[PDB]
Amino acid sequence: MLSFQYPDVYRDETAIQDYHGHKVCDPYAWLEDPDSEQTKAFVEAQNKITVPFLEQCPIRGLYKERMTELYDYPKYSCHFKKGKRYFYFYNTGLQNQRVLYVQDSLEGEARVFLDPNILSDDGTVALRGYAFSEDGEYFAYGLSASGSDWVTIKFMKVDGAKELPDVLERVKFSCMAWTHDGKGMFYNAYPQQDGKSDGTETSTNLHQKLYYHVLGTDQSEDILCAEFPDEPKWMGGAELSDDGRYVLLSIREGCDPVNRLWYCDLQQESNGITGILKWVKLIDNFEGEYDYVTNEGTVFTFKTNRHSPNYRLINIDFTDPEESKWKVLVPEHEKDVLEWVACVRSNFLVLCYLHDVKNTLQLHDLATGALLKIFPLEVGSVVGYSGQKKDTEIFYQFTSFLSPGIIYHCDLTKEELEPRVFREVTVKGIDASDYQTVQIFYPSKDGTKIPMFIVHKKGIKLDGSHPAFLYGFGGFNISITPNYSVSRLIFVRHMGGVLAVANIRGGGEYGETWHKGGILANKQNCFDDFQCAAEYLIKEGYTSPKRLTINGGSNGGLLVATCANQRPDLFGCVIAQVGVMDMLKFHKYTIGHAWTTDYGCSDSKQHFEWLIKYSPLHNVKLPEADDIQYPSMLLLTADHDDRVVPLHSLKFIATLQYIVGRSRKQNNPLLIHVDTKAGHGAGKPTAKVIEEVSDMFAFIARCLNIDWIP
């Protein structure tokens, strides 16, 4: 199998740090500098062995060809109205980036409004955020290059798609909100910093501020509206109330679903937006989340988790703000999570719930909160929606494991609300009726029942002979719901595989309690839950250890890397994408400081004690038993991944190759592929997406010796 030799990698044996009395050696600390000749040489040498390994077996070509054929289907976003026009995103099939279209009426001819594809040869410049002025006549849009979180905001006049001179730099993790007078827009920007700000730097991002840009002026003239100099990690995002009277500021610190909520009655400004606004600190702590839904005068409707982990809707009257006075409009459900809420047609509320990891959609009355209509959906997820307060209709997109998705439309002006299919596309080549999706609940180590979806060809024998692909994330209140994936379906159909997704703790599937069950001191619950999912698939006969592959990205990369260290005997292959591997230093780079709410921080003695036990980089160790080696492992990262700096994967693979790779019993490959002109993943062009999945499945195919099934 292995016809390559791992590259020489210098070990700085003097790199020792004391963590509250615990000495930790970091021999590859030098890989933290992306710009050094040493790090660049390291990346080149790794890619040098990884690429030929992935490209050698013709199965990569077969997969790539089938992926290009099957992924080539029309992809539409929900239509949405702004002013007197309708807009929608659309990709004919294989365009690198989806294009934004505009039409003057639902029946009118559409025309290209904004095509990101012409901004680069390889589709590496992508739209990242946008906002139309209240009247829909002006448009602001963010552009990111090479996958970086950094954004440059540009502007256009909608009538005639005219490019305007306005350009905003140093924008990142930014809100985009126009004042209803159409004069300008609020946005966030970071102070100037030494070195690069292109996605290849590792510099921590602090002191984000809120600015107001007046259309037709230079950015140097922008008004500073809010800043938190004594709290470097605070981030304040603005949004205008539906009536345009109030600017609502949501201040966050970390990744927990909580925020301070301050407001500014624009009518009360002495002379417009001229400097720091007269903020009224309605909710001035980080004890709960308050997500604006709508307001009627001074009565504000918010979605909250304040003493309601499954979320609920409350009305806070700015004129009688005390908590004891808040009205509960839609009480918290016993088990179902209220995911999001939208106000449409003035007095209707669209509520989307997650019931056992499946979405439900319903219409409620704004005044009473009473249920009015249930919008029927098959088992799956609602991944798109449109319908603001002044709109008289809604569009929503549904997807599932076996269906590319349906876009529905409902005219809310009709006495009898009847949702209708507005757009639907089927993928020729994947007959959804040949497969079935089942949801089971398995007990974890502590007995907690964890949901898991399994997708497989109908009528298979549970004899343990099938290759399996198990996916998990487990963290940040993120719910892993059903979604359509051509790449995974090719694994099922053409590689005879079984797909599994485990809804492990740390996610938001069962509200904030589920989230808390997989963070801080309890992070190990995530790893235990996932390992138990693998054991369930094995015990029930869906697969066997040597045929099992586990995959996860970012926090999911951490998930699979830890599982490889803790239970190498349980998996045959592990693909960790853009994963956090150095749990002792993650907080030091870019936006990593925000993740301490889920993981803790090594600066704390108590936290260090939890972290050191599972940190991937610090737990690589040769399996005790002679008959056990590490599973085949592939780490995937990119040079502009400024979300999770690539040094995580670089130090981790150096460690894996040295400690485990050098052992005689280790025959399974331990590799890394670092892509160029790409980042964490958002905005990645179709061409790159195709290459990435082709790499993943070719790796699985080679390592597990799986034959292609025509």
Ligand SMILES: *C(=O)[C@@H]1CCCN1C(=O)[C@@H]1CCCN1C(=O)OCc1ccccc1
């Ligand atoms: C991938 O899971 C990485 C590593 C662990 C957390 N994470 C993220 O990307 C998190 C979770 C999804 C969003 N995110 C993030 O850092 O967003 C940036 C941010 C914006 C605003 C406030 C705080 C953070």
